[PDB]
Each structure stands twice: as structure tokens, then as C-alpha cells.
Amino acid sequence: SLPVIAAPSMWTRPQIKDFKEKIQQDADSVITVGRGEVVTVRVPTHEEGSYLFWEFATDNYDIGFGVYFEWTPLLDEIVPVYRRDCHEEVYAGSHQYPGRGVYLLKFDNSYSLWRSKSVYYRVYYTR
Amino acid sequence: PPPECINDALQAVDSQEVRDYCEKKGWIVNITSQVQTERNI
């Protein structure tokens, strides 16, 4: 049979100001998504069974967010892209590695005609 | 330390401190600097 993929986990936590100021230290962890733009963050390949952790937030507005997995071009839909209010709270989640491959974090502003978004993000994995 | 257990913990108690603790013990690794970015319109 084809691999069964684990359901992702998602949660929020209330301290956004502290997150941003912490993430602001590394300037490359903060990216501007232009009007009508989609920025895809590609996480380096890791071993099966591990977990990817992601966190993100924005300043003044919501942004579209989803997660796909690219096998070592087959893609799987982990977290469907949807708009989140990550300006109100820090958004975080996790997924178990189905196999060896690249994770794609989609920050999707494509619906926004007049507004650029500032995205503060961070990622971990388990050894 | 099972990854499944690290995962379960981070849902309930999530904080910078817990993440720091797990990173010190070598359980999790911060890869944010090692990513590639692709920008489409």
C-alpha cells in the first residue's frame, strides 16, 4: 500500500510580541511577502519518523499558510493553505516525517492586492 | 527521548523556555537559517 501520512498538529500561544522581538534578532527569519506574492520556505531533507516544528507570526494582518511535503516531483498536502490570524497570536504546529524529503511552508499573500505582509518564522526538527 | 513525546509536550506547555530546554539537551535543532526561499507571483 501507499504510505499512510500522519495528521498534522496545530496550536497557538498568546505571546506574539515576545516571539517577534526574539525572532527579530536573526534578520533572515523575517521576510516581507509582497502584494499577490507566494513565498515558499523549503526545509532541508531529514530522516523518516522525525518531526518538523514550525512557528510563525505577522505584524498587522493575516496571511495564507499551508504545508506540503516533497518526496526525494511528488507533493503531498499536509496542511491545506488557508488564512490565519497570526497577527493576533503566534501560530505553531508539527508533522511527523513520512519519509525522506523537503517540507514546503507556504506563506500565501496572493489574495492581497494592496497589502504586503511581514512574516516572522522559525523551524526545528527532532534528531 | 521519543519524538512523539517531544511533540505531545510542545502542544500543552509551549514556551521559549521549553524549546530552549529541548535544544540544549540536543533533542531539537534550529534549522531556520538553512532553508531555501522561492518567491512566485
Interface residue A30 vs chain B (CB under 8 A) = no
How far apart (Å, rounded) are the C-alpha atoms in residues B13 and B3? 16
| Nearest chain B Cα distance for residue A1, angstroms | 24
| Nearest chain B Cα distance for residue A61, angstroms | 19
Q: How was this structure determined?
A: X-ray
- Which amino acid type is present at position A70? E
| Nearest Cα to Cα of residue A11 among A118, A103, A107, A95 | A95
- Cβ <8 Å between A127 and B40: no
Number of domains in chain B: 1
Strand partners, A75: A70
Number of CB pairs, chain A paired with chain B, less than 8 A apart: 86
Residues 6+ apart with CB under 8 A from A120: A19, A20, A23, A24, A29, A30, A56, A57, A58
**Cα-Cα-Cα-Cα dihedral of B13, A58, A10, A42, to 10°?**
-110
- Which amino acid type is present at position A11? W
How far apart (Å, rounded) are the C-alpha atoms in residues A25 and A124? 17
Write out the H or E segment, with its range, that includes residue B11: helix B3-13
For chain B, give the number of residues.
41
Structural domain boundaries enclosing B1: 1-41
Interface residue A31 vs chain B (CB under 8 A) = yes
Alpha-carbon torsion B7, B9, B13, B15, what sign? Answer: negative
Angle separating helix axes A16-23 and B16-24, nearest 10 degrees = 40
**Cα-Cα-Cα-Cα dihedral of A76, A45, A33, A89, to 10°?**
80
How far apart (Å, rounded) are the C-alpha atoms in residues A92 and A101? 21
Return the residue of B nearest to A126 by Cα. Answer: B28
